[PDB]
Amino acid sequence: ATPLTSLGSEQAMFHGKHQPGITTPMQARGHLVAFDLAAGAGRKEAAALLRRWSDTARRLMAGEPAGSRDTDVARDAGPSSLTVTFGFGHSFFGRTGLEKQRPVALDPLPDFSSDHLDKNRSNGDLWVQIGADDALVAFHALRAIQRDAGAAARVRWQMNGFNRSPGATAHPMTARNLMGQVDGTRNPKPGEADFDRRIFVPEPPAWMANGSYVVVRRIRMLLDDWEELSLKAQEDVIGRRKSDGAPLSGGSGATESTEMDLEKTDGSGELVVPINAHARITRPDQNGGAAMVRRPFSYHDGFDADGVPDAGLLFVCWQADPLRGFVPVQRKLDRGDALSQFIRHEASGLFAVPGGAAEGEYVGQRLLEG
Template identity: 35%
Template sequence: MTSENKNKSGVSRRGFLAGMGIGAGAGVLAGGGGVAAYSAETDSTGEDSSISFRDAHQAGIVTAQQEHLHIVAMDVLTEDRDELIDMLATWTTMAERMTQGLPAADESGESDYAVPTDSGEAQDLGAKNLTVTVGYGPSLFDDRFGLKNSKPAQLNPLPTFPSDQLKDELCDGDIVIQACADDPQVAVHAVRNLVRAGSGVVEVRWSQLGYGRASSTTTEQATPRNLFGFKDGTRNIHSSETEAVDDFVWSDEAGWMNGGSYLCARRIRMLLELWDRQNLGEQQATFARFRKSGAPLGTEDTDDQEFAEVPFDLIYGREPVIPEDSHVFLSHPENNGGARILRRAYNFIEGSDTFGHLSAGLFFIAFAGKPEETFIPIQMKLSRNDRMNEYVRYESKAIFACPPGLKEGQDWGTQLFG
């Protein structure tokens, strides 16, 4: 999806970052004027690579999955509701600009004597299909900001699942920003500048980089591979499945969450050293798919069989060909009352652990309109019985309610607080 969507106004009501040059007081939030000065809407190949910011639903959910992720969860520091509303308005303007390849704020009034309004590292990179998706955690709806009565129905802290090995500092959060782009620096730049603009109002709780997509959300995209070497995303919900998207991705509950989606996140460490010592048969039995083609066991190991039906009833000798503890058996809709989720996961490798092993894994993100009927029961089943559990450690959990898309003239502050 390309966009002709130029920057809209959306002026912050307070200059809480005026000292730095960010905020309404500093005239940073461009209306028409500042925008004309920039035209970074094409990438280095000259092709338009920006994605519309305003739509019925937020971008970054069914959007063709970009290659890179920077996701950050924040806690709100202020107890002043207006300060939070102002920050969300400022973020909206900044996010909209950045998704169009513009600097986070209008730089026309800059001087050697003022702090630059944009941190600068994405200046020549264009939009690179950047999407910025916001979401709110259950804790934001406590007593602090008068939001108690507008808490979405299914926004409850995720349960602790069997075999979780959670690190508390990587869990939960009041607000999430998911930035995805086809250039890592563009995603990092977006998060960095929003965090910077939120200084004093929010602080970072956890953040995660993902360097390669491990799902596909459209049929045009080839299925990528995860760090176990398997194709991942074959049976994902694809954006062209409009009925499934409506049934399983968008929330139909009343109130501001209507048309939004719940973001369910799990940082899953993958024990590559252990996995890399297993024979191919065991690896394939773990997923019930061939490693090479991604086709289900019991079919041909050829690329044209990747999307073949999974033969759950096929018996070989006395055993089912699709092991009942395999990841696909346990997560397939047929064995979950038809339930489906939209996966948007990313691979990560970040340094090493203290035992001389790579610290690698999958940052799993699922979007669900009704997580209590889809994501949670599927995850519960996997956490109990998945053969894959021997090779992974679930280190975090978080859930956020992502509101629907913004209408013209609306910003995230007025959308949430009315």
């Protein structure tokens, strides 16, 4: 039996080959933040900031108070699966005399025809992902990281999200999103032969060894439109059942794990999984092997004057190279996906997330020490 107390007592590793928050299980609470370096902050100031942040992250992920006078907001709680993950934006390198170390992988994402990006709420020099299963643990961490930045960097944008909690279901199962879909069934996962090739920069720029590239997209769901559709219409947009996430090509004994049949046709000769269904056209085998790990949070930030919900998905994906992951898939989806009609990409960021800190190190040390 899994005890209730495991929610708090579960602890993620800070030190490791890879940073936490990539293969870590889904967390109930998320805070994404971007910071811009202050005028006059260069390499040396940036290195000091990453040391402060890494010292803080190490402490908080072990359920210990912050290095400087802790607020007590997380006191009483266990680590609650807190993770803190750090990335660097294209713009960071030009602020710190590190242009020669800027990866080609940080070249700007395309201007997709369906983009509706608030550029002020996009991009940024530095990115931090905080997640935990307790909201006080998570907020405490956000606040400590943000306070560590002080005058050295300002908050450029900051978004809040959530997911299903541990124990909400009778047994662990794939999460849902605010469209009601089963979301998370098909991802690359650790132990697959090609997982590292797909997701992480290998050990043989050198500072990104064992790192990954994240693309963040704030995707509003057009729930007012979506929720007027029939079930058949909604399932045809994805190619999978809302009940259990099974492919539409499955019968009654099909489950979430049943393999999709992309050739199956009904009695009229029409494909059972539609030609433009999201879960057809996003597959690696439909994109020359293009692949990513998806690890999102859902969001809801209110209603506008007409009752339209500011709700959707904080889409967060991980890949060794955006040109073999997010970019080619999104080029296809832009106009090609049945889902595009029902969503709006409203903010974006692409960040280089290095390998995990070893004992005594700070995240990004190889970059900033050189």
